[PDB]
Ligand binder design. Structure first.
Ligand SMILES: Nc1nc2c(ncn2[C@@H]2O[C@@H]3COP(=O)(O)O[C@H]4[C@@H](O)[C@H](n5cnc6c(=O)[nH]c(N)nc65)O[C@@H]4COP(=O)(O)O[C@H]3[C@H]2O)c(=O)[nH]1
Ligand SMILES: Nc1ncnc2c1ncn2[C@@H]1O[C@H](COP(=O)(O)OP(=O)(O)NP(=O)(O)O)[C@@H](O)[C@H]1O
Ligand SMILES: [Mg+2]
Length: 177
């Protein structure tokens, strides 16, 4: 683990260019960068891997649209209340937000509980490993984060990563043990 202080906007915008090459015109990839984006502390290559795994899943999900499916990567500073509303119950203040959303078929309710399981997949035996989301989940937890999935059939799928805001001005947390 090589944690560093990262600007959330720079992280996604720089990576977006590389991601667009990976996706080609399989999807229309859109963005929505919020204003006054926070810094976070994380391993950069791990967050990139997590976003990449989500983005390729979104592409897979909207393949049947043959060029018309839409995948959005959204970033924001959320208020505590917005974060709770978007599915982070333990939000305690301003929160960093990364969300990969698509307009695909969504996740069947009977599948939802097992999507993060190592090796769970709906693809045939020769394609992939079924670790994409297990890796994402692990990365989010290693980054002291929370992930929430919002999806119903006919509602697309949104994978929402909530990370602590890092503030360089914050006083050192400390205690007398
Ligand atoms: N030794 C070892 N311990 C492990 C491992 N994976 C998890 N744990 C520990 O197992 C506890 C229970 O995990 P859970 O059943 O997923 O139960 C979780 C899960 O239901 C939920 N949860 C935690 N983080 C997230 C998240 O980011 N998104 C969602 N949707 N649920 C979450 O909150 C519950 C409590 O989470 P924690 O307080 O982190 O408590 C975790 C953690 O202390 C492992 O590989 N090795
Ligand atoms: N955006 C999405 N929309 C609908 N279903 C999804 C989405 N993302 C993940 N899933 C489901 O969750 C499963 C697990 O995803 P994942 O863990 O990435 O494995 P995988 O994509 O099947 N193979 P791989 O990522 O190559 O290892 C997928 O096979 C889908 O059934
Ligand atoms: Mg995958």
């Amino acid at each position: 683990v090589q944690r560093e202080v990262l600007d959330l906007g720079e992280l996604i915008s720089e990576f977006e260019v590389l991601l667009r090459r990976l996706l080609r015109e399989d999807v229309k990839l859109i963005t929505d960068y919020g204003r006054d984006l926070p810094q976070v502390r994380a391993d950069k290559s791990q967050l990139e891997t997590a976003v990449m795994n989500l983005a390729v899943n979104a592409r897979d999900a909207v393949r049947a649209a043959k060029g018309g499916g839409v995948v959005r990567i959204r970033t924001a500073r959320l208020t505590r209340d917005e974060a709770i509303q978007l599915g982070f119950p333990a939000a305690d203040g301003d929160t960093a937000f990364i969300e990969v959303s698509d307009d695909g078929p969504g996740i069947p309710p009977d599948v939802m509980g097992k999507i993060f399981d190592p090796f769970f997949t709906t693809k045939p035996v020769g394609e992939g490993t079924g670790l994409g989301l297990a890796t994402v989940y692990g990365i989010v937890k290693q980054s002291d984060g929370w992930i929430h999935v919002h999806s119903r059939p006919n509602e697309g799928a949104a994978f929402r990563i909530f990370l602590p805001v890092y503030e360089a001005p914050a006083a050192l947390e400390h205690h007398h043990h």
